[PDB]
Motif scaffolding. Sequence first.
Motif, PDB file in Angstrom:
ATOM      1  N   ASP A 113       0.758  -1.017   0.031  1.00  0.00           N
ATOM      2  CA  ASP A 113       0.111   0.099  -0.073  1.00  0.00           C
ATOM      3  C   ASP A 113       0.828   1.350   0.093  1.00  0.00           C
ATOM      4  O   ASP A 113       0.550   2.269  -0.757  1.00  0.00           O
ATOM      5  CB  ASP A 113      -0.773   0.003   1.210  1.00  0.00           C
ATOM      6  CG  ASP A 113      -2.230  -0.612   0.994  1.00  0.00           C
ATOM      7  OD1 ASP A 113      -2.411  -1.366  -0.163  1.00  0.00           O
ATOM      8  OD2 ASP A 113      -3.119  -0.913   1.799  1.00  0.00           O
ATOM      9  N   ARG A 114       1.809   1.345   0.906  1.00  0.00           N
ATOM     10  CA  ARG A 114       2.717   2.288   0.801  1.00  0.00           C
ATOM     11  C   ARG A 114       3.409   2.782  -0.456  1.00  0.00           C
ATOM     12  O   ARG A 114       3.417   3.751  -0.952  1.00  0.00           O
ATOM     13  CB  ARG A 114       3.869   2.215   1.992  1.00  0.00           C
ATOM     14  CG  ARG A 114       4.771   3.434   2.127  1.00  0.00           C
ATOM     15  CD  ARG A 114       5.779   3.482   2.963  1.00  0.00           C
ATOM     16  NE  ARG A 114       6.697   4.559   2.965  1.00  0.00           N
ATOM     17  CZ  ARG A 114       7.870   4.482   3.944  1.00  0.00           C
ATOM     18  NH1 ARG A 114       8.245   3.560   4.640  1.00  0.00           N
ATOM     19  NH2 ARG A 114       8.599   5.605   3.991  1.00  0.00           N
ATOM     20  N   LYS A 115       3.945   1.715  -1.156  1.00  0.00           N
ATOM     21  CA  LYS A 115       4.512   1.757  -2.357  1.00  0.00           C
ATOM     22  C   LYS A 115       3.573   2.286  -3.384  1.00  0.00           C
ATOM     23  O   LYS A 115       3.966   3.248  -4.024  1.00  0.00           O
ATOM     24  CB  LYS A 115       5.290   0.299  -2.922  1.00  0.00           C
ATOM     25  CG  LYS A 115       5.946   0.408  -4.397  1.00  0.00           C
ATOM     26  CD  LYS A 115       6.200  -0.974  -4.891  1.00  0.00           C
ATOM     27  CE  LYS A 115       7.167  -0.932  -5.824  1.00  0.00           C
ATOM     28  NZ  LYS A 115       8.188  -0.208  -5.685  1.00  0.00           N
ATOM     29  N   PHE A 116       2.484   1.739  -3.545  1.00  0.00           N
ATOM     30  CA  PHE A 116       1.552   2.303  -4.438  1.00  0.00           C
ATOM     31  C   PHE A 116       0.954   3.562  -4.160  1.00  0.00           C
ATOM     32  O   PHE A 116       0.941   4.401  -5.139  1.00  0.00           O
ATOM     33  CB  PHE A 116       0.250   1.141  -4.292  1.00  0.00           C
ATOM     34  CG  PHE A 116      -1.260   2.001  -4.760  1.00  0.00           C
ATOM     35  CD1 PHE A 116      -1.295   2.120  -6.120  1.00  0.00           C
ATOM     36  CD2 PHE A 116      -2.258   2.300  -4.005  1.00  0.00           C
ATOM     37  CE1 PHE A 116      -2.362   2.666  -6.619  1.00  0.00           C
ATOM     38  CE2 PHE A 116      -3.311   2.570  -4.541  1.00  0.00           C
ATOM     39  CZ  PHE A 116      -3.568   3.204  -5.786  1.00  0.00           C
ATOM     40  N   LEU A 117       0.631   3.960  -3.022  1.00  0.00           N
ATOM     41  CA  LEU A 117       0.250   5.143  -2.730  1.00  0.00           C
ATOM     42  C   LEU A 117       1.346   6.421  -3.240  1.00  0.00           C
ATOM     43  O   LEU A 117       1.218   7.187  -3.918  1.00  0.00           O
ATOM     44  CB  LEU A 117      -0.103   5.447  -1.467  1.00  0.00           C
ATOM     45  CG  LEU A 117      -1.525   4.615  -0.930  1.00  0.00           C
ATOM     46  CD1 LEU A 117      -1.608   4.927   0.771  1.00  0.00           C
ATOM     47  CD2 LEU A 117      -2.591   5.044  -1.944  1.00  0.00           C
ATOM     48  N   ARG A 118       2.753   6.085  -2.552  1.00  0.00           N
ATOM     49  CA  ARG A 118       3.691   6.945  -2.589  1.00  0.00           C
ATOM     50  C   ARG A 118       4.187   7.080  -4.142  1.00  0.00           C
ATOM     51  O   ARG A 118       4.878   7.945  -4.417  1.00  0.00           O
ATOM     52  CB  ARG A 118       4.880   6.457  -1.700  1.00  0.00           C
ATOM     53  CG  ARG A 118       6.165   7.086  -1.933  1.00  0.00           C
ATOM     54  CD  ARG A 118       7.116   6.750  -0.976  1.00  0.00           C
ATOM     55  NE  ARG A 118       7.252   7.705   0.144  1.00  0.00           N
ATOM     56  CZ  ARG A 118       8.043   7.514   1.230  1.00  0.00           C
ATOM     57  NH1 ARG A 118       9.026   6.476   1.212  1.00  0.00           N
ATOM     58  NH2 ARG A 118       8.046   8.540   2.235  1.00  0.00           N
TER      59      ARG A 118
ATOM     60  N   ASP B 127     -11.941  -8.449   7.396  1.00  0.00           N
ATOM     61  CA  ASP B 127     -13.174  -8.636   7.102  1.00  0.00           C
ATOM     62  C   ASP B 127     -13.871  -7.247   6.677  1.00  0.00           C
ATOM     63  O   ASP B 127     -14.537  -7.000   5.906  1.00  0.00           O
ATOM     64  CB  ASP B 127     -14.230  -9.093   8.031  1.00  0.00           C
ATOM     65  CG  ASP B 127     -15.338  -9.846   7.715  1.00  0.00           C
ATOM     66  OD1 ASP B 127     -15.838  -9.519   6.696  1.00  0.00           O
ATOM     67  OD2 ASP B 127     -15.814 -10.654   8.399  1.00  0.00           O
ATOM     68  N   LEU B 128     -13.374  -6.021   7.507  1.00  0.00           N
ATOM     69  CA  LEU B 128     -13.954  -4.849   7.374  1.00  0.00           C
ATOM     70  C   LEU B 128     -13.772  -4.318   6.072  1.00  0.00           C
ATOM     71  O   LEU B 128     -14.632  -3.671   5.209  1.00  0.00           O
ATOM     72  CB  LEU B 128     -13.422  -3.836   8.369  1.00  0.00           C
ATOM     73  CG  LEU B 128     -13.938  -2.457   8.393  1.00  0.00           C
ATOM     74  CD1 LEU B 128     -15.358  -2.250   8.790  1.00  0.00           C
ATOM     75  CD2 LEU B 128     -12.878  -1.382   9.022  1.00  0.00           C
ATOM     76  N   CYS B 129     -12.529  -4.560   5.538  1.00  0.00           N
ATOM     77  CA  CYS B 129     -12.167  -3.821   4.045  1.00  0.00           C
ATOM     78  C   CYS B 129     -13.188  -4.396   3.112  1.00  0.00           C
ATOM     79  O   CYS B 129     -13.055  -3.713   2.162  1.00  0.00           O
ATOM     80  CB  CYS B 129     -10.771  -4.173   3.639  1.00  0.00           C
ATOM     81  SG  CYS B 129      -9.551  -3.279   4.729  1.00  0.00           S
ATOM     82  N   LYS B 130     -13.647  -5.672   3.198  1.00  0.00           N
ATOM     83  CA  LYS B 130     -14.835  -6.006   2.138  1.00  0.00           C
ATOM     84  C   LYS B 130     -16.142  -5.831   2.634  1.00  0.00           C
ATOM     85  O   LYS B 130     -17.037  -6.158   1.929  1.00  0.00           O
ATOM     86  CB  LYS B 130     -14.578  -7.441   1.997  1.00  0.00           C
ATOM     87  CG  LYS B 130     -13.167  -7.753   1.791  1.00  0.00           C
ATOM     88  CD  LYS B 130     -12.875  -9.614   1.619  1.00  0.00           C
ATOM     89  CE  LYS B 130     -11.488  -9.717   1.255  1.00  0.00           C
ATOM     90  NZ  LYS B 130     -11.380 -11.526   1.098  1.00  0.00           N
TER      91      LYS B 130
ATOM     92  N   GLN C  16      -9.614   2.494   2.527  1.00  0.00           N
ATOM     93  CA  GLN C  16      -9.185   1.193   3.050  1.00  0.00           C
ATOM     94  C   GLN C  16      -7.700   1.487   3.443  1.00  0.00           C
ATOM     95  O   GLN C  16      -7.233   0.936   4.318  1.00  0.00           O
ATOM     96  CB  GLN C  16      -9.228   0.190   1.897  1.00  0.00           C
ATOM     97  CG  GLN C  16     -10.633  -0.552   2.033  1.00  0.00           C
ATOM     98  CD  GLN C  16     -11.092  -1.539   0.906  1.00  0.00           C
ATOM     99  OE1 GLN C  16     -10.423  -1.505  -0.111  1.00  0.00           O
ATOM    100  NE2 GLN C  16     -12.184  -2.175   1.268  1.00  0.00           N
ATOM    101  N   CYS C  17      -6.845   2.069   2.392  1.00  0.00           N
ATOM    102  CA  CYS C  17      -5.421   2.292   2.710  1.00  0.00           C
ATOM    103  C   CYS C  17      -5.681   3.197   4.060  1.00  0.00           C
ATOM    104  O   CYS C  17      -4.480   2.855   4.964  1.00  0.00           O
ATOM    105  CB  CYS C  17      -4.802   3.117   1.452  1.00  0.00           C
ATOM    106  SG  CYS C  17      -4.262   2.200   0.384  1.00  0.00           S
ATOM    107  N   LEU C  18      -6.073   4.011   4.202  1.00  0.00           N
ATOM    108  CA  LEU C  18      -6.330   5.007   5.396  1.00  0.00           C
ATOM    109  C   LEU C  18      -6.475   4.107   6.678  1.00  0.00           C
ATOM    110  O   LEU C  18      -5.849   4.048   7.680  1.00  0.00           O
ATOM    111  CB  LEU C  18      -7.320   6.147   5.288  1.00  0.00           C
ATOM    112  CG  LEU C  18      -7.561   6.776   6.628  1.00  0.00           C
ATOM    113  CD1 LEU C  18      -6.426   7.696   7.080  1.00  0.00           C
ATOM    114  CD2 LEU C  18      -8.949   7.864   6.780  1.00  0.00           C
ATOM    115  N   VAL C  19      -7.551   3.104   6.552  1.00  0.00           N
ATOM    116  CA  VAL C  19      -8.180   2.250   7.591  1.00  0.00           C
ATOM    117  C   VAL C  19      -7.050   1.429   8.157  1.00  0.00           C
ATOM    118  O   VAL C  19      -6.561   1.496   9.170  1.00  0.00           O
ATOM    119  CB  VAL C  19      -9.210   1.519   7.220  1.00  0.00           C
ATOM    120  CG1 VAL C  19      -9.419   0.458   8.007  1.00  0.00           C
ATOM    121  CG2 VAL C  19     -10.757   2.323   7.249  1.00  0.00           C
ATOM    122  N   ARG C  20      -6.148   0.751   7.278  1.00  0.00           N
ATOM    123  CA  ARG C  20      -5.123  -0.121   7.484  1.00  0.00           C
ATOM    124  C   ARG C  20      -3.952   0.746   8.056  1.00  0.00           C
ATOM    125  O   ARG C  20      -3.384   0.445   9.217  1.00  0.00           O
ATOM    126  CB  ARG C  20      -4.600  -0.574   6.400  1.00  0.00           C
ATOM    127  CG  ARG C  20      -5.421  -1.900   6.090  1.00  0.00           C
ATOM    128  CD  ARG C  20      -4.980  -2.823   4.597  1.00  0.00           C
ATOM    129  NE  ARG C  20      -5.283  -1.970   3.726  1.00  0.00           N
ATOM    130  CZ  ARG C  20      -6.284  -2.319   2.931  1.00  0.00           C
ATOM    131  NH1 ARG C  20      -7.298  -2.798   3.255  1.00  0.00           N
ATOM    132  NH2 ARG C  20      -6.168  -1.388   1.855  1.00  0.00           N
TER     133      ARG C  20
END
Lengths: 213, 48, 84, 267, 146
Positions: E20-25, E74-77, E101-105
Amino acid sequence: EDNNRIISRLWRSFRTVKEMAADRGYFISQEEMDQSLEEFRSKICDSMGNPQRKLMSFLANPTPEALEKYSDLGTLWVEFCDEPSVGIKTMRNFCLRIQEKNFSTGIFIYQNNITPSANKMIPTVSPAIIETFQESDLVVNITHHELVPKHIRLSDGEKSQLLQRYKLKESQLPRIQREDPVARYLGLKRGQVVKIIRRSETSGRYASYRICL
Amino acid sequence: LIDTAVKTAETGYIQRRLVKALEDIMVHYDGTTRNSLGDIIQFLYGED
Amino acid sequence: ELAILKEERTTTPYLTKYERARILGTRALQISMNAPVLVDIEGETDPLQIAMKELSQRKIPLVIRRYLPDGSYEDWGCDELIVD
Amino acid sequence: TPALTVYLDREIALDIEKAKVIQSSIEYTTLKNVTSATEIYYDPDPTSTVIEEDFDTVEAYFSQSPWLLRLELDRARMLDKQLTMNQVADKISEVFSDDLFVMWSEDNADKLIIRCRVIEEDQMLKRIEAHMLDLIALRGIPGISKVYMVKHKVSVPDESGEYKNEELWALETDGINLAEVMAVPGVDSSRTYSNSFVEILSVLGIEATRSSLYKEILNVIAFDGSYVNYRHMALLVDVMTSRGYLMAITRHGINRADTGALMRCSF
Amino acid sequence: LGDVELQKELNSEYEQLVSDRKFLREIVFVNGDHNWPLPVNLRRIIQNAQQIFHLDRAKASDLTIPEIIHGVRDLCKKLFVLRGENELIKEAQQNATSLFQCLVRARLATRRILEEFRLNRDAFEWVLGTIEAQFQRSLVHPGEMV
């Protein structure tokens, strides 16, 4: 010198064309897109350094994955115009060569222009489909500029399912001009649907559909 | 004073034009943003 | 045809503000013009208040018909809709 | 306000001298700039001249109609643009081959003089003089009046994963020519941006046009210090280019839409 | 200490965060600006949970890491945006909640929960229910003449 920059530009254009052919679904030898500048010089540039345009034409063929994905992706012919200017005779003989060799798709590249009369009879080679691209327009690949996102074509099944999903009509979707530079680069045709995924600052990955005109 | 007097009318005109342009766009149930005819401008309003 | 079966209903199950307002106004009108009341009245003589209370108890006999963009519709019950 | 923001090469972006060279290359200085004077001397003798300004120089260089077109140049302009006069003579040669013999003085001479000899003609000499002062281009992409060696600061990730500032040179220009400049060597052709989204549509397709339009609107609104929710401006742009071409918001674009008549009539 | 079946869950979640960090950044935010509008504020929900259960002191958490990661995954889905079983529907659902979802994680990481928040089991349950409902109410309704 002037010749050197000219050759560099020609090589960059050739790289652009090769990458374009690769993107549409047509296989090429991997090192070829990796073709270095000086091997290009030796392969094409004359003893004096002058290029040999006829020494540039070549052929490519659909990759089996794309070939099965897209049913109509047939043999592609490419070719460079020797004449700095284009006349009717040149396009007539080029069309005849395409027809005899029986290439479903052909591409022509000039240097200065195409006489409007020649342009008129361009769509007169059906079902074989022909196109042109100025050399200077192909110096830099547009799909590799920062702003431009990556377009992706759809199969008939894919587009049909998409339309079934929203319960739509082909006209109801956003439209991209068939003369849109990207549309040319991807060789877009009427009725096709290209999906564009975009960097969205509210969901990161917004997938956008479009139809062509 | 002159600047304010001029600017007010032009701003009003621009706002009028915009409002007229987008006046028909609404959000259906499917989550897609369509004008009257049914054209889809955004598949998910604002992308979220 | 234009209807869609309750097994495959896809629209959101929460009651949107517009649906709330329309149902409230419709019911309060009906209430205020001699329509029966599906819940008790103790001090709230205001028909709008009666409608608000009746909705809070999920005792309102009205079916929303939402129109899909194409022209098809689906039928949600005010009973089933999840009121926030 | 036509303006370009040209990103230089990573090496050149941190390289001031190569930035200067690249700018000088792109700058569209034409022979009109360099020229200082233009005088028509009637030299009856093709073998020599009756004028002391170049008599010694032309005579030493030596070892048809007699009308002579003699023009002067400003040393400062040539030296500042780094191009020497002999290059000016050469360029005149390619543009006009041999219709005008180009006899060129030496830089050590105080007046850098290029001589043109023609090969009722008095007016034709002045007409050639005019067409010369104008339709000859020495260096630079056409359409670039001036270029600016703008410096830039940008957030850059670092080894540890942090983001660190990094001063980088850059070129800003007045005058818009999007397609041609990207092919100029020494410039990142994947990022360069222009302020006229019309050229964005013309060159980099539609989606790039959408993004550039949005960026321009955001810059315009936010310059004062204000802020607007992004979704609204996104909806505005994505409506503006839903059909695929700039639906400029006026009577024309709105009414040219094929929506109901009652709609377009009221506006 | 030294266990592995927990180490594998932790490794999976950590790899998810790395991706996620790689993707966003590298895709979303090029310059590095990490301040943006997103739905359903979290810090407030976290501190409301803290207050509601008096979560100061160094009282040891009684919450199992597997339960935490199970709920998070489970939440993310569960963040419904479009309701329907077409594949394209599900792909759109995935695309919409990507940054949320990225923020939540980014917030509800096991280390973060156990140390900075020290929630209990019921506190975590309430946090998840709260995020769910708050997001579900934060949708644009049908009919908005946006």
